[PDB]
Design a protein around this ligand. Structure first.
Ligand SMILES: C[C@@H](NC(=O)c1ncnc(N)c1Cl)c1ncc(C(=O)Nc2cc(C(F)(F)F)c(Cl)cn2)s1
Length: 256
């Protein structure tokens, strides 16, 4: 069992509040991060066990290392502490300009982690550049840092907006949107004023990311893989084994 006894974790500075919990930087055999959740509902009790039950089946370098959980005194999830910023903070706030060599490496590590999740039959359900942490500004760490559960429509597939929806291809579309941010430095649909139409237009199949805003030095394989990841039909979107294979081969083309 991975239950951490009460009294071992030294809760420290608060990292950021949410509508569903708060996260602190704790001390527990080193630097750790603890997300603690007044009265737990039967849903919150199950939602906590679902998030821990998913993190228990993860043991990969590109996935945030789950370390333990606690029920006393509060429902908590203990993970490793990583320094740096998320990919959304690098490309759309800090404006960190990466070499094309490193942009492919960030996409490669992201595809490696997404490949490992699908092997374990795990759907991320909320893959975005904000949930992609750059540990030491080098290693990609995939997690779910959402503290409210929905301001994350740019990464939602058309079939996810049309409630009939989470699948491997829905995560592939999110990965395709992340590729758009990497190759453009901007979020999709930046020229749209409100989000009412973005929900309606993308769900209707008449709004797609303008694939001409990509940088000049973007390889032709990245433009083709990004387009296939953004197909409106789910069955026309590839699987991450095929996605990772073409990126790792493309990556070896840049290293001399
Ligand atoms: C305690 C808190 N840790 C931090 O926030 C943090 N960690 C490192 N460095 C920092 N600076 C910070 Cl601030 C977290 N508890 C659970 C987290 C999580 O990702 N759960 C999760 C993961 C997956 C995945 F399988 F896709 F990965 C899925 Cl599918 C669904 N849920 S994250």
């Amino acid at each position: 069992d991975w239950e951490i006894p009460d009294g071992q974790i030294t809760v420290g500075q608060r990292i950021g509040s949410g509508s569903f919990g708060t996260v602190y930087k704790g001390k527990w055999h080193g630097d750790v991060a603890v997300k603690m959740l007044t009265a737990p509902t039967p849903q919150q009790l199950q939602a906590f066990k679902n998030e821990v039950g998913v993190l228990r089946k993860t043991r990969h370098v590109n996935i945030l290392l789950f370390m333990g959980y606690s029920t006393k005194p509060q429902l908590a999830i203990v993970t490793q502490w990583c320094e740096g910023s998320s990919l959304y903070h690098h490309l759309h706030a800090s404006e960190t300009k990466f070499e094309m060599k490193k942009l492919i490496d960030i996409a490669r590590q992201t595809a490696r982690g997404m490949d490992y999740l699908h092997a374990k039959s795990i759907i991320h359900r909320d893959l975005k550049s904000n949930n992609i942490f750059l540990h030491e500004d080098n290693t990609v760490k995939i997690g779910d840092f959402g503290l409210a559960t929905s301001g994350s429509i740019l990464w939602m597939a058309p079939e996810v907006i049309r409630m009939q929806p989470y699948s491997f291809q829905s995560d592939v579309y999110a990965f395709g949107i992340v590729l758009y941010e990497l190759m453009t430095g901007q979020l999709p649909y930046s020229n749209i004023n409100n989000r009412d139409q973005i929900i309606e237009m993308v769900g209707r199949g008449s709004l797609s990311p303008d694939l001409s805003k990509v940088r000049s030095n973007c390889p032709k394989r990245m433009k083709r893989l990004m387009a296939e990841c953004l197909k409106k039909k789910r069955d026309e979107r590839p699987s991450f084994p095929r996605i990772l294979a073409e990126i790792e081969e493309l990556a070896r083309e840049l290293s001399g």
